[PDB]
């Protein structure tokens, strides 16, 4: 696969998408510096519309923990009916 191919499902929990993005990026053949740039751009870029809105709002200084918290329940809540 390619990191370029990883995108958040329409209703996928942000936490699940980040996990998939990380797993793919670990395997990607690129420089560390490039992997940093990929994370800094593609993770938010390829989030679904509803998460993407939240992530942009949080700003570039946000931590992963903060992103996770802000996107909790978007697409969800995902409990059995």
């Amino acid at each position: 696969t390619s990191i370029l191919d990883i995108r958040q499902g329409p209703k996928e929990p942000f936490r699940d998408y980040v996990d998939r993005f990380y797993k793919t990026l670990r395997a990607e053949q690129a420089s560390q510096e490039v992997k940093n740039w990929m994370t800094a751009t593609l993770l938010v870029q390829n989030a679904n519309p509803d998460c993407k809105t939240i992530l942009k709002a949080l700003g570039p200084g946000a931590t992963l923990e903060e992103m996770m918290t802000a996107c909790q329940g978007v697409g969800g809540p995902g409990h059995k009916a």
């Binding site: 560390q32 940093n36 800094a40 931590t63």
Partner: peptide, 11 residues
């Protein structure tokens, strides 16, 4: 965030 943040989070 950077790849290093991912490594820290999941590592």
């Amino acid at each position: 965030i950077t790849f290093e943040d991912l490594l820290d989070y999941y590592g």
